[PDB]
Ligand binder design. Structure first.
Ligand SMILES: *[C@@H]1O[C@H](CO)[C@@H](O)[C@H](O)[C@H]1NC(C)=O
Lengths: 49, 50
């Protein structure tokens, strides 16, 4: 079988941002509105974003 | 088996109305925006190796 096209936000590949050959993107266009939302509580993402 | 199904956190524990209840809570916040605590993880959360 092929890989599963991983699901929404809380999927296993994201909340473990220690990875360099996963889906390696978190593009999130610079200075955008959703640039702030990823600076709310959890520095887990904004560090690899 | 997949992903988590109930969210929560960790934390220090202190008897109610202890004096340090304020300064302690502070140095944790400072450590997140600083980047020390986050960089600490790799040293003990090292690679996958599998
Ligand atoms: C704790 O914070 C208070 C208020 O900022 C400060 O006066 C004190 O020196 C700090 N250290 C201790 C040991 O309370």
């Amino acid at each position: 079988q092929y890989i599963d096209t991983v699901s929404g936000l809380s999927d296993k590949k994201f909340q473990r941002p220690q990875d360099q050959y996963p889906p390696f993107r978190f593009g999130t266009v610079p200075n955008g509105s959703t640039e702030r939302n990823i600076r709310s509580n959890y520095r887990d993402m904004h560090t690899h974003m | 088996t997949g992903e988590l199904f109930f969210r929560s956190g960790f934390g220090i524990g202190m008897r109610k109305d202890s004096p340090w209840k304020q300064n302690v809570s502070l140095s944790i916040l400072k450590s997140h925006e600083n980047g020390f605590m986050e960089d600490l993880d790799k040293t003990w959360v090292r690679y996958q190796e599998c």
